[PDB]
Amino acid sequence: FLGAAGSTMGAASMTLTVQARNLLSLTVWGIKQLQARVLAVERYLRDQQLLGIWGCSGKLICCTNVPWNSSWSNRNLSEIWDNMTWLQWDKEISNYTQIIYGLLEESQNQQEKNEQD
Amino acid sequence: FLGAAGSTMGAASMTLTVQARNLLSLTVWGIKQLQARVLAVERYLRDQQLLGIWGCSGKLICCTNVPWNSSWSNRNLSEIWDNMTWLQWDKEISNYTQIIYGLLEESQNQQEKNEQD
Amino acid sequence: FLGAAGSTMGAASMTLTVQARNLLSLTVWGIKQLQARVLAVERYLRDQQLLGIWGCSGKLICCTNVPWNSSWSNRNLSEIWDNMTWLQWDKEISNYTQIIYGLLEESQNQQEKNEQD
Amino acid sequence: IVMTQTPASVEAAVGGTVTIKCQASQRIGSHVSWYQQKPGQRPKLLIYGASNLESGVPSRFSGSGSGTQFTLTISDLECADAATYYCQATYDPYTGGSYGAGFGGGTAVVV
Amino acid sequence: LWVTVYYGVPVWKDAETTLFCASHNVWATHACVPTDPNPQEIHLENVTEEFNMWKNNMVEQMHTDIISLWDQSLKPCVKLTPLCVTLQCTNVTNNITDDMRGELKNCSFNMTTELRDKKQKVYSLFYRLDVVQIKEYRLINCNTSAITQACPKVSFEPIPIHYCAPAGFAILKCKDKKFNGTGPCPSVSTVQCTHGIKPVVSTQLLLNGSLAEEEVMIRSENITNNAKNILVQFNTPVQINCTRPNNNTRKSIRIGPGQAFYATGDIIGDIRQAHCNVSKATWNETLGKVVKQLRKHFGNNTIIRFANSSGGDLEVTTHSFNCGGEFFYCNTSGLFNSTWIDSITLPCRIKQIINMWQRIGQAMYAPPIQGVIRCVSNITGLILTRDTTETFRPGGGDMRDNWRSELYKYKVVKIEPLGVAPTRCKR
Amino acid sequence: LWVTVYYGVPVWKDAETTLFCASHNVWATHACVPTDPNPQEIHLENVTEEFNMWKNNMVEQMHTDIISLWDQSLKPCVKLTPLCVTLQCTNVTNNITDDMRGELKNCSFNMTTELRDKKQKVYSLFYRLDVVQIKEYRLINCNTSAITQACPKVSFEPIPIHYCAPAGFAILKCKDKKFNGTGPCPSVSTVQCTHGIKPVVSTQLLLNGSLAEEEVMIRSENITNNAKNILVQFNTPVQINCTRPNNNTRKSIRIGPGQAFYATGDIIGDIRQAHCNVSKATWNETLGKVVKQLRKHFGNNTIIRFANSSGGDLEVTTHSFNCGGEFFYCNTSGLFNSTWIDSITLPCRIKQIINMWQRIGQAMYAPPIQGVIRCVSNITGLILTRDTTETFRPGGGDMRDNWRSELYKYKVVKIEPLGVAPTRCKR
């Protein structure tokens, strides 16, 4: 059901409905199933909470109020969307994940709410 | 808390806030409670995931971009909303559920997103 | 990570992204962890279900169609937002919680849906 | 189920150089062999993988490539060394086998 | 005005949940969540909150879990049922001091070998406190409960654990010097996990706990009601040095297929009495501080008398000390012998058959430890009871009163993030 | 440009999770999730991924679960403690061949009856490998561990199981012929569940596993380091036919209320030695292929010598074969007897007292099976160790090195569906 099969980010961005569904889909082999079901739920909810707080809930593609900081990359969109595998991209900017996520939260709480009320 | 008590689809569509809430609401009778709580959560989340992917999240009534295919029914809306019990309706078109759901996902991913970005 | 640290409701309403995240964040000390994880999930989902049914999903601040009934309070907004700690406020109107919540559900099901379809 | 070849036909003077090129529809590492087929004869192997010649093959034949882009350079062309050259994928990325699995070509090299 | 819904509001209410353990040893378990190497503590400005150490359910959870672990860890061990046999037994006299006369006995008996059709004659040296005279003796508790030996590889060291709230919950800590057992305090902070608490098990004198920072604290329910225990927390440690001077050996005796009994062996060197040394001047200053604080509730010119103990069993009248896995029952008299208007040597006894949290129906046998034991501990507080002059003496009781002295600072609350307020806006 | 968030991105990272079982027998459990009758396999074009069979935690889970099941399934069975009695015992000579002289003994003993005040005199024929001479004998392990008989209704057949990842996780399979134990491979597919793996337990020769598809595969860590095992996977099966020719009977002897011991009975017909027949020509071609492949790492003109075994216990020096529930320890010599520059009959022994995964502290007794056993298996690979000439010989070790030969193709990964990229759009 996975992509990144030579699929560059442009094409890969269109297969999101598949990968988004396979996230949820007292014997030795008894208790283990209960523990495994709980784990699957936990991961699902953590991602949904982030989409919620950033205002991306219900969407596969979410444009936000955070500008791209050039310190995060050394390529043009015309280079990455056409030549890079989603998987390669994620590895290249992995060390900025926590920066972007914090900015995304502020971009909602303040910009779309405290300033809108 | 259940409807379909002689309630045709028109009237039944208005009671959705009740039925939508009763979905979530190491001894022999110890471990069983833990297993039962996990099951209740699992069912709740599966329905929420479908509403999310179809763009029906947060709504009780959701109009979509999928046209009704006449091959799915032999009745007018003027006949089913007034004369059929929600329960009867669900049984009559049960064999098309998987068709409609696949169409609903495409109607979002492509029509409301890949074509909007 | 908690507020209400002398923070009146005005200021407190701006820290919601923090408190909203710490809600999700067969040995004696084995089975207990499994039970505790299930509890944390259960509480998270109950609050999300209420936000969903009231049309407040995805938001930290949600204005609704329910008017404030003066029988619920003895103060002006100019008095409570500036002089009361969120915590004090919640205690003062705690006995009306169930009234407000029922009104909020009707304010969606009927006013935003049955009357919009 | 992998290779395509594009030059179709090339002419050169005696002592000159020509090149030909193949592409893979799927990445196949360095798993491309090359053949020389003279008219009326069964084909001869020139190259094992993208960078390796078979013993007995003149040093004037050489090549390289990886992933999906592969080439063959034939220098010091000898008079009347005319042949059709071909590419073969020696790796099947779908089944995992490593054997000739798809073949194609056509170069009309004339000297 | 209109109703506006807010989510993530900083509101909490009192709650009871189970707690997570964070951190081979009998209690350590080695199945706890690794702790946060850089834990956070969040101060709450202008927050006053009410705590009650006597009604704190964290105490009950510590008690329940430690008992359950005791059994989960020691249950899969060798049973000693075959030792409930008439013993032939006489006094050890070969190389002893006067203080040890009658303390040890050399017992011998007919016991099952690897084969069930054969018997072996074996011997073990037992402490007087473990046998009952019927030269014929019975082991203590062969008429009351089954005896299981503890597994020799299991450590009894009081390795600390931390309790952590589940997401959706938090633990509030009362950071307030001079705060007694109950009431509001103006200094509160939020933590997710507690400080590490060592599951130290003792009676009369609390060992290796936390210290008070400004003054000796006297915490009790009521005070004037003399049916309650007084927990006294020192603001300075008193160092106590305990020893078991005899060099012991041990024997492994097969009691049937797959099992062996750890018997005591012979003693190397002369036989001396176990004892604890409490620094004397330190102890005298420490009690003077306790007295000055006690007078605040009894009168500035009231005589405060300290007595040794009430009558009772060893678990009541002697200090209970568990170190190295050995079980000591110390005299604790001479420490409490004054009216208030070098070292103190406390003779101490050793017992191997233990009845502890489950007072009846179950017994555990502490196997011998070879060599000599030296143990140094911090006295951090006292358990006192009260009787012109007030009389106080060492008390005791269930472990809950000792463990609550490390949890008096914590309360469990739940977070209620969803609520409403009137605003000038509308949908 | 602006940050755009994408959800459901096809991104994965290495992960360790527990796996689900999908599929009365001792391992089958009959509490697994029914498998998908039409499972999917999804090919990943242009994906190269790195696998390492020696660091694969799926091996550790198989090992841990199979051991836990062994005990969960055999724990609630009759204990044989009463048989640890001096036995009076002499050789079986009534109708035997030369190869069996001294192999079986007729033992008799005094054992507990339904009533505890009465004894019965019973007998059983034991294999030499199960007793210790003290005409007086002890059973093996009555001086080491408790012996519990396996329940007679429990099957030991190696019924295959499938491992399945939890939602949010996936298993990647390396579909690459000629792929060795480590490194990247260009052919990867995604599955949710593994192929079925039979929990076959053996030593020296791997039975009933998967075959290589193009060439005999030689997989090892290092190769040049002779401290590591070499796993050799055949691309063709070698058929091996094992038998236990004696027609046995069995007896049920009550050992007290609610319990009975399964004793061996009398033997019908003459007594012959158990043995295995390996087709000879097939075996000779199979090793020739192994040798041609071994030379790739040792030299084209290097002599490859095969020796029978190192010294050691039966679990090391003989082939371990479990079939019908009977436990065989086969000679495995003559199969490895060459330098490389009809059938082979392997004499085989039978043992009933088993010490397997838990090497000490526990023993299991295999009850007798009535009648005659004939078993046909596929040799799918070898466990070899290495010592001008290289010398190789059958090896052994913990079961993890045998089970990893069926899991070398799999890796567990986690899905990380949420991430960002710069785009020409904005909110």
Ligand SMILES: *[C@@H]1O[C@H](CO)[C@@H](O[C@@H]2O[C@H](CO)[C@@H](O[C@@H]3O[C@H](CO)[C@@H](O)[C@H](O)[C@@H]3O)[C@H](O)[C@H]2NC(C)=O)[C@H](O)[C@H]1NC(C)=O
């Ligand atoms: C109060 O805290 C002190 C300090 O942690 C505890 O003392 C420690 O006790 C353990 C157990 O007896 C000692 O460990 C042993 O050390 C010997 C080597 O000398 C080793 O052979 C044993 O196998 C074992 O590891 C530890 O050294 C000792 N620490 C110090 C600094 O002396 C004391 O037990 C605690 N009090 C109570 C009542 O629990």
Ligand SMILES: *[C@@H]1O[C@H](CO)[C@@H](O[C@@H]2O[C@H](CO)[C@@H](O[C@@H]3O[C@H](CO)[C@@H](O)[C@H](O)[C@@H]3O)[C@H](O)[C@H]2NC(C)=O)[C@H](O)[C@H]1NC(C)=O
């Ligand atoms: C390798 O695979 C083969 C084929 O599955 C295994 O052989 C099978 O072994 C079982 C157990 O001994 C046989 O079942 C028995 O059959 C008799 C009737 O003949 C019945 O009375 C017993 O109650 C039991 O059901 C099974 O027939 C046999 N299969 C074949 C085709 O002969 C072999 O055991 C595996 N090797 C190893 C080491 O596990």
Ligand SMILES: *[C@@H]1O[C@H](CO)[C@@H](O[C@@H]2O[C@H](CO)[C@@H](O)[C@H](O)[C@H]2NC(C)=O)[C@H](O)[C@H]1NC(C)=O
């Ligand atoms: C059960 O079915 C009956 C009809 O078969 C429903 O009765 C009618 O309800 C309508 C309102 O929807 C009224 O205007 C009619 O006058 C009723 N008929 C009679 C004879 O009284 C009845 O409402 C159904 N039950 C429920 C709960 O909907």
Ligand SMILES: *[C@@H]1O[C@H](CO)[C@@H](O[C@@H]2O[C@H](CO)[C@@H](O)[C@H](O)[C@H]2NC(C)=O)[C@H](O)[C@H]1NC(C)=O
């Ligand atoms: C605790 O309460 C005090 C007042 O009782 C708050 O102090 C004032 O805060 C405002 C800002 O909101 C300042 O303009 C005033 O000058 C402060 N007063 C003084 C005397 O300095 C205090 O901020 C509250 N604590 C918190 C965290 O909000």
Ligand SMILES: *[C@@H]1O[C@H](CO)[C@@H](O[C@@H]2O[C@H](CO)[C@@H](O)[C@H](O)[C@H]2NC(C)=O)[C@H](O)[C@H]1NC(C)=O
């Ligand atoms: C694997 O990579 C190759 C290129 O290295 C991709 O092949 C090209 O795909 C484009 C469409 O995106 C076609 O227009 C080209 O003609 C293809 N090249 C050749 C030589 O055929 C291939 O599509 C990638 N695999 C996947 C699944 O995307």
Ligand SMILES: *[C@@H]1O[C@H](CO)[C@@H](O[C@@H]2O[C@H](CO)[C@@H](O)[C@H](O)[C@H]2NC(C)=O)[C@H](O)[C@H]1NC(C)=O
């Ligand atoms: C007895 O109390 C002393 C004093 O509090 C403890 O020694 C301190 O330990 C902390 C670490 O927990 C160090 O940071 C201090 O520097 C130490 N102070 C001194 C004077 O040494 C001692 O560890 C306690 N002993 C026991 C068994 O708990």
Ligand SMILES: *[C@@H]1O[C@H](CO)[C@@H](O[C@@H]2O[C@H](CO)[C@@H](O)[C@H](O)[C@H]2NC(C)=O)[C@H](O)[C@H]1NC(C)=O
């Ligand atoms: C308990 O033992 C400690 C040592 O572990 C004793 O303190 C030491 O005393 C010597 C002098 O005899 C000094 O040289 C050391 O520097 C001291 N060590 C420490 C850490 O202070 C202590 O006196 C003993 N207590 C009792 C009551 O006997």
Ligand SMILES: *[C@@H]1O[C@H](CO)[C@@H](O[C@@H]2O[C@H](CO)[C@@H](O)[C@H](O)[C@H]2NC(C)=O)[C@H](O)[C@H]1NC(C)=O
């Ligand atoms: C508390 O101290 C008193 C006074 O010493 C103890 O009473 C007697 O003490 C003498 C030694 O001076 C003993 O020989 C007597 O046997 C003690 N009397 C009794 C009845 O035992 C008193 O026992 C001490 N109490 C405790 C619990 O130790």
Ligand SMILES: *[C@@H]1O[C@H](CO)[C@@H](O[C@@H]2O[C@H](CO)[C@@H](O)[C@H](O)[C@H]2NC(C)=O)[C@H](O)[C@H]1NC(C)=O
């Ligand atoms: C021994 O190996 C043979 C050959 O691989 C196995 O027989 C094949 O079994 C598959 C089903 O798994 C069939 O589709 C093939 O047609 C069979 N081939 C032949 C030649 O019979 C045989 O089952 C294996 N034996 C054991 C015990 O595993």
Ligand SMILES: *[C@@H]1O[C@H](CO)[C@@H](O[C@@H]2O[C@H](CO)[C@@H](O)[C@H](O)[C@H]2NC(C)=O)[C@H](O)[C@H]1NC(C)=O
């Ligand atoms: C192992 O047993 C098989 C049968 O289960 C033997 O193969 C059979 O041999 C006879 C001739 O004696 C043929 O008629 C059958 O058709 C063969 N059957 C099969 C399935 O091949 C095999 O030879 C025995 N192996 C050894 C080493 O003795």
Ligand SMILES: *[C@@H]1O[C@H](CO)[C@@H](O[C@@H]2O[C@H](CO)[C@@H](O)[C@H](O)[C@H]2NC(C)=O)[C@H](O)[C@H]1NC(C)=O
């Ligand atoms: C490996 O083979 C050698 C050679 O046969 C074995 O050595 C001796 O073999 C003879 C039979 O030819 C026996 O009678 C001797 O008892 C064997 N010697 C010893 C010391 O046992 C050798 O034992 C074989 N090794 C293994 C593990 O089977």
Ligand SMILES: *[C@@H]1O[C@H](CO)[C@@H](O)[C@H](O)[C@H]1NC(C)=O
């Ligand atoms: C105990 O008795 C045995 C004889 O049964 C003797 O050898 C041993 O020395 C005695 N031990 C002591 C401490 O008296």
Ligand SMILES: *[C@@H]1O[C@H](CO)[C@@H](O)[C@H](O)[C@H]1NC(C)=O
């Ligand atoms: C053993 O101790 C008792 C109690 O003190 C004493 O009466 C008896 O005489 C002692 N026996 C020996 C041999 O010393």
Ligand SMILES: *[C@@H]1O[C@H](CO)[C@@H](O)[C@H](O)[C@H]1NC(C)=O
């Ligand atoms: C062992 O049993 C014999 C039976 O004759 C008895 O005389 C002897 O005193 C017993 N010995 C012990 C140490 O109990």
Ligand SMILES: *[C@@H]1O[C@H](CO)[C@@H](O)[C@H](O)[C@H]1NC(C)=O
């Ligand atoms: C065991 O014997 C002692 C003898 O002092 C007695 O006090 C105790 O009550 C007895 N135990 C039981 C359970 O009867």
Ligand SMILES: *[C@@H]1O[C@H](CO)[C@@H](O)[C@H](O)[C@H]1NC(C)=O
């Ligand atoms: C603790 O302090 C409060 C006042 O803050 C006081 O009312 C209460 O009685 C004190 N507790 C005890 C046991 O004296």
